[PDB]
Every structure is written in C-alpha cells, then in structure tokens.
C-alpha cells in the first residue's frame, strides 16, 4: 500500500538504482555463504581438537568466533552504507 511513501526520507528510485541495490544484496549473500563456511570450519576445528588442551587453549586465545562475528557485522553495515549511497534518502 505504498508503505515506503509513508516513511520520512522516501525518494523515487530508477530501475538502475534498484538493480544496483539488488547487486549489493546478492554479493552480500555470497559473503553470508562464505561466513557460514568459515563458521562450519571453526566448529570442525573445535571438534577435531577436543582433548588437546593446548590446542583448545590456542583456539580460545585466538577468539575466532568473535572475529568472525565482527567481520559479519562490518560486512552488513558496509552493505547498508553502499545501499544508502545509491538510495539517497533525503533524511538525516
């Protein structure tokens, strides 16, 4: 019901702008797949390293799950900024 026109900052977008935005989102989905793969790798690494207290300590000290989460958040906020550069909402 044209909900977007009810939200402050709405701007009419061309097809080229919509296509660029969807390009961002589809490259983002490839990053989501990569991040899932890394997370699976981390889980297998943690598993295979069970009862290797030195290697469990190494993994805990490198904090890879935390770094993967930081990376996911940066990728997602970067996508939002790029999409904002295309959409150009009039609002602050």
* Contact track, ligand 3AM, 1-40, x by CB under 6 A: ----------------------------------------
Closest to 86 measured CA to CA, from 5, 23, 31: 23
Distance CA 45, CA 78 (A): 29
As a whole number of angstroms, the distance between CA 39 and CA 57 comes to 18
**Does residue 68 contact residue 35 with C-beta atoms inside 8 Å?**
yes
CB of 92 to ligand 3AM, least distance (A): 13
Which residues of this chain interact with a second copy, rule CB under 8 A? Answer: 2-4, 6-9, 12-13, 16, 18, 20-32, 34-35, 37-38, 41-42, 58-59, 61-62, 64-65, 67-68, 70-82, 84-86, 88-92
């Amino acid at each position: 019901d044209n909900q977007h026109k009810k939200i402050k900052g709405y701007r009419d977008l061309s097809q080229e702008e919509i296509d660029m935005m969807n390009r961002v989102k589809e490259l983002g989905s490839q990053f989501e797949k990569l991040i899932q793969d890394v997370s699976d790798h981390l889980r297998g690494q943690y598993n295979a390293s069970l009862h290797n207290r030195d290697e469990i300590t190494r993994i805990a000290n490198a904090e890879p799950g935390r770094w993967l989460a930081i990376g996911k958040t940066d990728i997602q906020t970067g996508m939002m900024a790029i999409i904002r550069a295309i959409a150009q909402p009039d609002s602050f």
